[PDB]
């Protein structure tokens, strides 16, 4: 249950993280999905070794700042991860997390139609996240509302925002 | 406190709104708001006189159908009703109950456009409501979930439904 | 259920009550209950449109002095009814009462005789109100104090006032 | 404090008691005044040992049937003896003892008649009773209830009975 | 249950026990039997009347000194009425409270000898006054202190004063 | 506080005291004072050293028949044992008392006639006890349930048993 | 049950238990066991007498310091008295106290060895005490806390002191 | 806060564990520190990734046996880390668990003395258990139970094992 981290390992990870920030402040749109994706790799070790030093640290003082950076970190290279649900109108937007919806749990439409937009948010992006090695929260979309809304695809589509089907 | 109702009444009254009932069935979208109009007034004083009929009765038990009626004839009628804020759009809609509001209240746009959605609709509806002595409820519109919200108008119209401002 | 008031209606009703109750203000002991009985009807509707009022008023609250003037023309008229229970003596005013509740409840009455002044009362008076629409209760007659007795009438006829039957 | 009766006495008084008992049940509306009266005398003496007898018992048993004849000779003298409140009337009773509260008590008539009937009675019977060495109570005149009611004089005499005064 | 005393008679019965009093301070050693025992037949019944006058009274005070007296003669009387158990030794005064026990109760001696003083005199002594209509207490006798003793005679015999049987 | 007895010990008491009872058996109406009395030092040894054994046992239990026999010695030696206040007479025994315990406590008489029978026999008996190293209990004179009167020496002497002072 | 001390006594204690402590305060390491052995015994009796004077005086002030001494010669001749667990290593004192156990209890080793030092010790102290008539504290050990450990033997043997078997 | 563990992962630690496992079984009496020691290490990292493991796992399932295989690895690793206060003695146990924590606290010998050896071993512990980056418990040394006496140091080598300072 109880173990300890390496001591060459601290600092190897806060100077490790520190050029990590400084190379992702450089993004802008036109780095490839090639850089951006290894920049996560990153980000998603030293999210990990993170959690590893905030448990170690924790059990420490019971025996009686790099968080902060990826804090940063995210908050840049948030701007940059695009999942296939990031659209130009609400109106694609509900569409692309429907289609999404139905490829993922391999459900018909007029089923996922039925299905509440929380659910089927929550279940696309925990994919996506998944997938990109990435937590994909809601407000990363313009939005951010529609798809907190606890109601039916179908619903939101046609008494929210006029759609079609 | 106490008031009767005079005999010749109730039977004249039950009648009354049967044959109104059968004038609301002939509504359709093209007969003139001055003809809808005074079948409103028509229904109102029928509302009016069973609430008194109603309150008789009750008072009469403790000394010890018609309002069926006028269930369906709101219903045939509820859709004939017009407001200014019936609009073919979810985003106009949104924009008459904003400007009808502003113009209720007298408030600046800047200021009810941080008003939710809630407040605003039914401080608009109650305002229609008195003004054609019909009640105008949110399920009078299309875009009924819409305008049930909790959500300022502001990010209802930029992150449910990509509008400018 | 809901129903809203006509307009020109509210001040249409208290200066049609105002003057009401400077008519009232007139009668006296010898005018025709002919006069009378119409300044009652007018009094019944003001009190039906005041509940009206009243309630919609309630409503309207919650979407956040006419009475009174009745109350005293209530007070002016009271006196001025008449029942067939009305009478001379306080041995007829029993029987009065007696021979109404049992026309009013078809009884026999060696029942009726058994039965507590207070139900054989307001059974009585509950039906003169119906009749008159006029509430008229037990203090617009002068026999107030007997005809609240809860004692039979057998009882009170014979051990309250020694009359015969 | 302590005290015991005379031997020859309990049987004494129980036969004296039995030949009392025999002669009221001869008494009617024509035996005088003036047999009547001695009735009670002896009723009144037998009453008296008897309170004797039931102590000097109860005594005796904590050092370890005349009163139910005397109950019954109550019974039968009860109906015999007249007081000058026993009236014709309902009305006249109320004034008798309205009058004679007044006499007893020396109260003007105006404060009298603010009375509620019932001291005014039972101070006024308490007093003849204690003149007549006889018990006299409410239900030893025709009017018990009257008697009984808990009203001033004044409105019992007008609402109650429509009297003048 | 309730009875009068008749008038002319707390102080036709004041009158007569002041002259009682009067006459039982002139008894001393040598007034006969005779003598004495009228002079308590009086006092019995200047004690029973005394028993009414307080009842009476108390009872009339809730419709809102004789005694005194009767305490003095007692306390004289009590001096001149002798059972036959006044003797002149504890020995003797033992016996006859035994042996009038035995008489009283019928009880063989050995029994008798078995019970307790206490018994022994207050059912002696309630017998002797019944029998001269006189309270006799256990201070009318020199011997008090023994006679309260909570012990077999047998006991007190031959324990407390050395006797044979 | 804690001791142990030496060990040929128990045994040395239980024979030293089988032998005890052998010579108390012996003793009768005429053993001299100067014999009785070595025999209760004797007894008095042995009932301490019972005393030290008994502690010693219970003691010992919590680290987890001689008294018979004093039992017997006592019922045997009591008998011989003579105070000054054996006497013949009820009421010399009470005399004796009195003086002796005047001669304790130096008291006048008066006040000594005035002390409740109870101290003046346990202050008397106390005493000799102390004197003749043997206690001297109330059922050791004929006269015990007089030694245990609650009551003065006074009262005692001339309500109980008719003495003079 | 009650009983008296001989009265040339307490003083004949006093000094005799006075030089007692005298001669024990001449003791030291070589004052043979022949020697420290009777003072012991002296020790021992005094102490008995103390309890039966201390019962002595408490019983007598029911009728209305030598202790000290014990106390200090208890302290000298704690210090001299030796039992056969008194050893020079914490290893050799546990073995005394196992063998002496099993001596005493008949157990075998096995169970011994499983028993909690705490009863061992305390069923091995009272013992010796009981056997020569001293009370034999753990605190006259220099290994009192291992005494005290609630802990078997074994694991004491093994865990706290690394001793074989 | 969130992060995802690299694919190629989990399989890559659960036979990367696996012949850990295998070369721990190998070590034995003579296996170099220099060994041993990254015999550790490999554990450490395993341990490490575990935890990884177990949180996402853990976290995943919310979205709705590696160390099984550790807690062998810990039980053989267990027995061949050595601490500097591993000795043959109970005695030198102390000693080096003394010494060893006056060197880590900076306090002096004799203040430490003071400190119960509970404080004392868990302060030890704790410290080596962070310095060799593998935790040690109590019962990794033969002496056990002495390390979890609640005594001071003092004591325990004075009272419960006969040392010297």
Redesign the interface.
Known sequence: ??????DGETSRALSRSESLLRRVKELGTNSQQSEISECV?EF??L??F???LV?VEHR?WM?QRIGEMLKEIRAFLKVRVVTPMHKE??SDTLNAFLEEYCRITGLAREDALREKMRKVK?VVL?HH??LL???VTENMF?????LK?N?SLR??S?????MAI
């Open positions: 249950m109880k173990f300890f981290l390496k790799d998603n070790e999210a990990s993170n959690h590893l448990t420490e025996e109108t609400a929550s925990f996240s998944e090695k990435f937590e313009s939005y951010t509302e529609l809304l109601l619903v939101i046609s008494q929210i925002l006029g």
